[PDB]
Design an enzyme around this catalytic site. Structure first.
Site, PDB file in Angstrom:
ATOM      1  N   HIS A 226      -8.305  -0.163   0.645  1.00  0.00           N
ATOM      2  CA  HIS A 226      -8.404  -1.130  -0.471  1.00  0.00           C
ATOM      3  C   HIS A 226      -9.753  -1.836  -0.589  1.00  0.00           C
ATOM      4  CE1 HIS A 226      -4.164  -0.110  -0.686  1.00  0.00           C
ATOM      5  NE2 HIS A 226      -4.109  -0.416   0.600  1.00  0.00           N
TER       6      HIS A 226
ATOM      7  N   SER B  65       0.824  -1.203   0.000  1.00  0.00           N
ATOM      8  CA  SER B  65       0.000   0.000   0.000  1.00  0.00           C
ATOM      9  C   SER B  65       0.862   1.258   0.000  1.00  0.00           C
ATOM     10  CB  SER B  65      -0.939   0.006   1.208  1.00  0.00           C
ATOM     11  OG  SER B  65      -2.245   0.410   0.836  1.00  0.00           O
TER      12      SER B  65
END
Length: 310
Positions: free
Chosen positions: A199, A93
């Site tokens: 996400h 990420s």
């Protein structure tokens, strides 16, 4: 003469003492801490070194991790014969932004400001939803995919490999899949510490505001390609970065696929920044080494490798 990739860690790798070792051994590290403290208008020495309450927020975690990654990169790069020339760079990420930045598409203070914002927007978008993330261990990637798809308010958020999958969603809705996960073979179910679900659709609100900030902040300069957590495809320009760092936010981090599709192109990995989270995930994913560069010790070990194997 062997060849290398760079790994940039994300959330879960921050720690009290994060870049302490760097700071004390190198003037450059000291200078970037100052530059950082000014840019973010918060004391970054104290936020990283002593127990503080602020480093717990996504808005300060994300730029702290970037900070140590950045410093790790500069220190190492300044000693590498001819500077770092990796075949590619992979992040997790928040690590992807780091990777894009160090490629040359994002100046130091601009990246701190973008990262602080990414954390702030993740927190804002998730406020008053009771959002969380939940590590599952030992259930198949495909089994959780279909479990989430038949279950309201729950999504797959990381595929970290070694049958480690992070789910995102409404707390109670996650905190309620327990007996079904158990029965599916989950050996461990840990909730991450944060009121954000990244996400997954919970981030939808922020996609446009973030895109805007990417367009305004990215230069078009990339010394090396980066691998998208979103599509597992390499990219090396502004248009693609804008698109791919946007899309990342609502799509599963496909860290497993990223390593596998790319493990053949190098002999070794450098984890730049604090911790050994990505060193750990690779144990289950590859037989190639990962020197972690978060320390002066790690710094010196990376340099030796380059002196010997180029």
């Amino acid at each position: 003469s062997m060849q290398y990739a760079l790994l940039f860690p994300g959330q879960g790798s921050q720690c009290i003492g994060m870049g302490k070792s760097f700071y004390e051994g190198h003037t450059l590290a000291k200078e970037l801490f100052e530059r950082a403290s000014n840019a973010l208008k918060v004391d970054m020495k104290k936020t990283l070194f002593e127990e503080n309450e602020l480093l717990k927020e996504s808005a300060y975690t994300q730029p702290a991790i970037y900070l140590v990654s950045y410093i790790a990169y500069q220190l190492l790069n300044k000693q590498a014969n001819g500077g770092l020339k990796p075949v590619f760079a992979l992040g997790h990420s928040l690590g992807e932004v780091s990777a894009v930045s160090l490629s040359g598409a994002l100046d130091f203070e601009k990246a701190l400001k973008l990262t602080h914002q990414r954390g702030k927007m993740m927190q804002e978008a998730c406020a008053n939803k009771d959002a969380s993330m939940m590590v599952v261990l030992g259930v198949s990637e495909e089994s959780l995919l279909s479990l989430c798809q038949r279950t309201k308010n729950v999504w797959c958020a990381n595929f970290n490999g070694g049958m480690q999958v992070v789910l995102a969603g409404v707390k109670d809705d996650l905190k309620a899949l327990e007996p079904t996960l158990k029965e599916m073979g989950a050996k461990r179910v840990v909730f991450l510490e944060m009121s954000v679900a990244s996400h997954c659709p919970f981030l939808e609100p922020m996609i446009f505001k973030f895109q805007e900030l990417l367009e305004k902040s990215l230069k078009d300069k990339f010394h090396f390609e980066i691998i998208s957590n979103a599509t597992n495809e390499a990219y090396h320009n502004k248009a693609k970065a804008v698109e791919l760092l946007s899309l990342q936010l609502t799509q599963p981090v496909r860290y497993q696929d990223c390593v596998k599709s790319n493990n053949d192109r190098v002999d070794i990995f450098f984890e730049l920044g604090c911790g050994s989270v990505l060193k750990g995930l690779n144990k289950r994913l590859s037989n190639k080494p990962t020197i972690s560069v978060g320390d002066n010790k790690g710094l010196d070990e990376a340099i030796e490798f380059l002196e010997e194997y180029v």
